[PDB]
Amino acid sequence: PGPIITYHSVTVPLARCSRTFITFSDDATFEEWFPQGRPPKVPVREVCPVTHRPALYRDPVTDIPYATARAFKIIREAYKKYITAHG
Amino acid sequence: TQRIASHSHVKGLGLDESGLAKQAASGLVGQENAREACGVIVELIKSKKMAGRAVLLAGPPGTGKTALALAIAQELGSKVPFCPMVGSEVYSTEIKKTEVLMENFRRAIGLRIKETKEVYEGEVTELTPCETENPMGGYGKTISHVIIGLKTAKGTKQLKLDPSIFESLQKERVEAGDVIYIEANSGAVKRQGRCDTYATEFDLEAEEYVPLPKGDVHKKKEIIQDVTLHDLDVANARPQGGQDILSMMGQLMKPKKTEITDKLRGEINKVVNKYIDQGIAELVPGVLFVDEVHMLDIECFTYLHRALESSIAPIVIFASNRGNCVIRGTEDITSPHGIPLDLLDRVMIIRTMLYTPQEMKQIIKIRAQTEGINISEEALNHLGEIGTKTTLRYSVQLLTPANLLAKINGKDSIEKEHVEEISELFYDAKSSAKILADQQDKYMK
Amino acid sequence: VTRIERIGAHSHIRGLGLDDALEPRQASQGMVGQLAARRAAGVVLEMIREGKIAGRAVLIAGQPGTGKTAIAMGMAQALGPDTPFTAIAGSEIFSLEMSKTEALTQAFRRSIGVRIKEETEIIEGEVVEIQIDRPATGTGSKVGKLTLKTTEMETIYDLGTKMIESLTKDKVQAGDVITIDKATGKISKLGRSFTRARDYDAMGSQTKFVQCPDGELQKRKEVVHTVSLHEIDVINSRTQGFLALFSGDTGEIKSEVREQINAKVAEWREEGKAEIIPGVLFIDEVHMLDIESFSFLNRALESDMAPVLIMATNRGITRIRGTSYQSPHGIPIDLLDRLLIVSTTPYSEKDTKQILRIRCEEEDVEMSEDAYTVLTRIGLETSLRYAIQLITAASLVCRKRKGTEVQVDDIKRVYSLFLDESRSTQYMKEYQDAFLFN
Amino acid sequence: ETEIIEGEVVEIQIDRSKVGKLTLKTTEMETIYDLGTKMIESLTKDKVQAGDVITIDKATGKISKLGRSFTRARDYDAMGSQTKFVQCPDGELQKRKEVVHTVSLHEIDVINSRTQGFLALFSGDT
Amino acid sequence: RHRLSRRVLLEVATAPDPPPRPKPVKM
Numbered sequence A: 001p002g003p004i005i006t007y008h009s010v011t012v013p014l015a016r017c018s019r020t021f022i023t024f025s026d027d028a029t030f031e032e033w034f035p036q037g038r039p040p041k042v043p044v045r046e047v048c049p050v051t052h053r054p055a056l057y058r059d060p061v062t063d064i065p066y067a068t069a070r071a072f073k074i075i076r077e078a079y080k081k082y083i084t085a086h087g
Numbered sequence B: 001t002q003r004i005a006s007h008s009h010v011k012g013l014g015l016d017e018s019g020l021a022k023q024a025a026s027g028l029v030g031q032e033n034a035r036e037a038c039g040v041i042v043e044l045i046k047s048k049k050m051a052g053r054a055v056l057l058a059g060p061p062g063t064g065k066t067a068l069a070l071a072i073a074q075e076l077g078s079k080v081p082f083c084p085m086v087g088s089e090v091y092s093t094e095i096k097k098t099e100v101l102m103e104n105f106r107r108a109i110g111l112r113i114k115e116t117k118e119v120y121e122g123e124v125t126e127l128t129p130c131e132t133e134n135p136m137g138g139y140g141k142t143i144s145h146v147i148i149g150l151k152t153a154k155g156t157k158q159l160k161l162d163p164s165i166f167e168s169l170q171k172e173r174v175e176a177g178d179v180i181y182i183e184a185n186s187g188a189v190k191r192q193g194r195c196d197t198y199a200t201e202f203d204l205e206a207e208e209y210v211p212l213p214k215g216d217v218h219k220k221k222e223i224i225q226d227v228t229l230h231d232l233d234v235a236n237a238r239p240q241g242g243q244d245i246l247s248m249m250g251q252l253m254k255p256k257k258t259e260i261t262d263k264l265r266g267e268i269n270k271v272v273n274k275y276i277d278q279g280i281a282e283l284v285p286g287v288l289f290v291d292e293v294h295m296l297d298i299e300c301f302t303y304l305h306r307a308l309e310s311s312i313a314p315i316v317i318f319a320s321n322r323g324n325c326v327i328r329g330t331e332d333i334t335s336p337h338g339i340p341l342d343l344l345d346r347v348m349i350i351r352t353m354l355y356t357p358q359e360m361k362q363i364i365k366i367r368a369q370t371e372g373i374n375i376s377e378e379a380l381n382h383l384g385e386i387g388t389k390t391t392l393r394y395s396v397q398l399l400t401p402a403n404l405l406a407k408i409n410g411k412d413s414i415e416k417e418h419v420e421e422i423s424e425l426f427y428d429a430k431s432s433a434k435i436l437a438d439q440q441d442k443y444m445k
Numbered sequence C: 001v002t003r004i005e006r007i008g009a010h011s012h013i014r015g016l017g018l019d020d021a022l023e024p025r026q027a028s029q030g031m032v033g034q035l036a037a038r039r040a041a042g043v044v045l046e047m048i049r050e051g052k053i054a055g056r057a058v059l060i061a062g063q064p065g066t067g068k069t070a071i072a073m074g075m076a077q078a079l080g081p082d083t084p085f086t087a088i089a090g091s092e093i094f095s096l097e098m099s100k101t102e103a104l105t106q107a108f109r110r111s112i113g114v115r116i117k118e119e120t121e122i123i124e125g126e127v128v129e130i131q132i133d134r135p136a137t138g139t140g141s142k143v144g145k146l147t148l149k150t151t152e153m154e155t156i157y158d159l160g161t162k163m164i165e166s167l168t169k170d171k172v173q174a175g176d177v178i179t180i181d182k183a184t185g186k187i188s189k190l191g192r193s194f195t196r197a198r199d200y201d202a203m204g205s206q207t208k209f210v211q212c213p214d215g216e217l218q219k220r221k222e223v224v225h226t227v228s229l230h231e232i233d234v235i236n237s238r239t240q241g242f243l244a245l246f247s248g249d250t251g252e253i254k255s256e257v258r259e260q261i262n263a264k265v266a267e268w269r270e271e272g273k274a275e276i277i278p279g280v281l282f283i284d285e286v287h288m289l290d291i292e293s294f295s296f297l298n299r300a301l302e303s304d305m306a307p308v309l310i311m312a313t314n315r316g317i318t319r320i321r322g323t324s325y326q327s328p329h330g331i332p333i334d335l336l337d338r339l340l341i342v343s344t345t346p347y348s349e350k351d352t353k354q355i356l357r358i359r360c361e362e363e364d365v366e367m368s369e370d371a372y373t374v375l376t377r378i379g380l381e382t383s384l385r386y387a388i389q390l391i392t393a394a395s396l397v398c399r400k401r402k403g404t405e406v407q408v409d410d411i412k413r414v415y416s417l418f419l420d421e422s423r424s425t426q427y428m429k430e431y432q433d434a435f436l437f438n
Numbered sequence D: 001e002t003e004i005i006e007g008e009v010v011e012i013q014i015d016r017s018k019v020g021k022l023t024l025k026t027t028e029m030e031t032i033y034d035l036g037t038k039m040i041e042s043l044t045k046d047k048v049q050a051g052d053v054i055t056i057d058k059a060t061g062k063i064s065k066l067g068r069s070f071t072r073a074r075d076y077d078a079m080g081s082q083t084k085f086v087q088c089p090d091g092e093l094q095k096r097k098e099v100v101h102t103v104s105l106h107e108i109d110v111i112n113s114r115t116q117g118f119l120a121l122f123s124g125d126t
Numbered sequence E: 001r002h003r004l005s006r007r008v009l010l011e012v013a014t015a016p017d018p019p020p021r022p023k024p025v026k027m
């Protein structure tokens, strides 16, 4: 024997009707084919801290979303100041 | 559509409900007997019970033969196929003339297919097997249904489906939050991407994120598709979409019309009959219009006998402005319309007469109305006098140059002086022929 | 609803209308008159049905509208679908893809059918229960079990891997009436004995059921495969030939291939594997063939695989195409010596009236006796085809005025509206200068 | 009129051909993108690497390479027939592309006649 | 707009290597 998936089609009274069944030998296969995943979560609409417009970009160095070149320059200036201060 | 062509004013045959032809209606003037005969032919086409019937429109040039055929086409409507064709088109470098004629015959026979497409749309919210409290065989878990939850803009429904769909779901890699559609007539699951509400502005996928479907989860509609027998023939002779080496060769090689065999056409006929019997399709026999039939050679004329004798052929309308001309492909054989008497015995001849000056003036006025041109009464009378000599086409072709000349002169209507100047600027066939004859030495050949 | 086949020129012809002694009835199966020509056609038809003499040629010659094509269609309808009947026009052999001799050869070989008859074991029953066990992960041997039922039997079958794959591909469920061929393993579903479970969704409207098959499960049935010589030639010419069976584009088939196929078919016939079903090739308007095509016909009729050739022509002493030689029927005398000629006499008044009556019956048109007399007079004066067309024209005119029977007034109306060749030629002579050339 | 992304590639990281990240920059901007399966496959097919200046169509996802940026380490002695060095684009990473061209009906017919019908617009084997 | 010039090419070639890219910081 072994881990198998059994496909079954029957004739049953309703004068007769057809029904199909699928049998999983082990619960691991059943979980793999049917993970019962929960519904996904809606991502939070990030906003640019500088211009408060809806975010469209994401500076990789600072991980701070932004939506304007001026916002990017301000963010990079702030990061440079942070590096200078903290060291 | 916005541009005005030569038969842009022909909106049909101006026939009363009793079939009598009104003097001026639907853009047509005069030709009452020919219009009545064409109305009878329209009724014949609509009856859909005759095959291979032929009609020849015979008359001098510029007498409305093409206009009458287009009026017939307008009367039938866009539902009925209408395949225009000139006789010169049978001469092809790829297929034989008889094949061109047969293809146009099959182009004239249309088929209308009506089907209902039932689909279930939605974003997958739930994917839950329906286990059975008594597992078959004692061990493991058995499932009797798979509950799929579909969410749309204006609803949410749950569908208890066959267990066999679990394989299609896994093959399509369908998970929660994905937008899928399931077809009832096939029982298959197709994943049309993931919902866009789960996409962020930082994602770069192109065809992965799709909007949430509008409307109801269960969508069913009636699909009306109009096809012709030639469409099926061509799609089966040079099929497109296969993944075998022959389809790849077809894609690589230059497309070329081929001589479709009677075997394929018989198979298509059988399939069409099967569809008609099932109620899926309704046959729409249309019209093949062969203008300038005199350009066909003796081989085409001989083939037309067998073509018209068929029980699948459409109703063919011919047109010829020739007199006792010599049949093409023959050496010094003359026939009344350039057509051998054997084919003339198989056609009904509709005669088109010449136009009186009043009818010419009416047609000129109609053409001026169609072209958006305001013409004064004196200018109209002068142009009709110009049309009494020369021809009608010359007069209707002087309308737009005269309108342009008036607009340049700063007038919103054509006066007589504009028509006189245009007549001076442009010559007709007879005046040019007189000039050529008067100076035959100075010209070439 | 209207089928793809509608009322045509020869839609009323259902056969030659002969008795056992091949004596033509005056009016039977659509044919009227032409007694001698119909008797000759019946003799030729008996010769075709016997199928013993190869390469016989018959020429149907007569004036236009005398029933040459009507006789050919009657012969075709009397033969039946079992015997091949290739009808072509003379113009069809002029092709840019193949030579004239190649086209004529293909026409000949489309008129000979090769039939292969074999007995195979067939399982036909109602599926009661199907179980298929497959490994959960990785390559493995699927194991399955199938139960089939008839009215008097029920057997449980142990399934092999390839039959398991076939059943999976066909998606065979319980209640499906399936056919299994043991050798090839092909499975054809032909219906459902009952509905599927109602609780399922997205299933569609259930169609009608099919009664369960009776008798034994594994029967023995006779399978008949019939192809023509042309189809064999095409599918053997090249690998892509089967597509050439539908697209044309066969080019010119090598003579070696045809010789091999002739040898193999003769071997099959001697071995009792296949039977040859010779048919008819009908070339309408054979006068369009040129001298080279006729010369090829001369010797191509001398083969034992040649069918019966039937030609129709309405030519008198006419120039042969491609030459400057005048010959009877437009046919060279060498070919005219190899063929029997069947003459068609013109129709009388009563024969014309009976033909008009048959046409009206075919078109579901009701006509008065006076209208029949007037139409017969017109047909005698002008032509038979003009009267046939006026039948439908007058039917439409009568229906327009909310009538039920075609009267003399309707016939006169359509006679005024639609012209014959004679009146059209007269009116063109009246305005000769208005028409373009001559 | 088409919306496009235009920038120079800084880093391409792919975890395992399942999910990855792409970093693009201009002279005034820089951002990181999450890639899917088809985007990763398209990037690997075109062999996009660091220093390449590319444009990506938002609607269709097709990637065309404009050039590569010049660095001190890219002083090649021999260059391929298609490589060319271009300046890093300025402005904003998201751009709109407007293309106006005049074609004839015959050209559209030849384009749609066969799979690669535009070749017949050069050869004439229509 | 973005064709290279000889001046830019010479400047880039002569200039030293750019400073190493800073590591990402979650801020």
Ligand SMILES: Nc1ncnc2c1ncn2[C@@H]1O[C@H](COP(=O)(O)OP(=O)(O)O)[C@@H](O)[C@H]1O
Binding pocket: B006, B007, B008, B010, B027, B028, B029, B030, B031, B060, B061, B062, B063, B064, B065, B066, B067, B068, B321, B363, B393
């Ligand atoms: N009786 C008519 N009423 C209105 N317009 C007409 C009439 N006869 C011809 N025309 C117009 O005059 C032009 C002459 O062309 P036409 O007569 O159709 O050529 P042909 O005689 O070869 O068919 C056409 O553009 C047609 O629209």
Ligand SMILES: Nc1ncnc2c1ncn2[C@@H]1O[C@H](COP(=O)(O)OP(=O)(O)O)[C@@H](O)[C@H]1O
Binding pocket: C008, C009, C010, C011, C013, C030, C031, C032, C033, C034, C063, C064, C065, C066, C067, C068, C069, C070, C071, C314, C355, C384, C385
């Ligand atoms: N003897 C006949 N019996 C019945 N119908 C006939 C007869 N002769 C001719 N017809 C009909 O008259 C029409 C024209 O005859 P056809 O056979 O085409 O003449 P041809 O011999 O010149 O081909 C055909 O539709 C045919 O059905």
Ligand SMILES: [Mg+2]
Binding pocket: B305, C068, C069, C284, C312
């Ligand atoms: Mg005939």
